[PDB]
Amino acid sequence: SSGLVPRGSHMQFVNKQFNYKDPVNGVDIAYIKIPNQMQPVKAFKIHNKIWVIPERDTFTNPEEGDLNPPVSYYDSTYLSTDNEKDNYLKGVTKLFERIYSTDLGRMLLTSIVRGIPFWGGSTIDTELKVIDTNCINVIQPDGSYRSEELNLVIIGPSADIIQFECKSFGHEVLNLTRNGYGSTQYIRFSPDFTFGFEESLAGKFATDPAVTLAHELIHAGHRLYGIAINPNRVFEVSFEELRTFGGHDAKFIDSLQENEFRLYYYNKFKDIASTLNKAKSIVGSLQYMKNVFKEKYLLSEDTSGKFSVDKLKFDKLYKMLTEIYTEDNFVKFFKVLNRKTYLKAVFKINIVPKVNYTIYDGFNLRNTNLAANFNGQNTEINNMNFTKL
Ligand SMILES: Cc1c(-c2ccc(F)cc2)n[nH]c1NC(=O)CS
Ligand SMILES: [Zn+2]
Question: Which CATH class for the 27-389 domain?
Answer without folding.
Answer: alpha beta
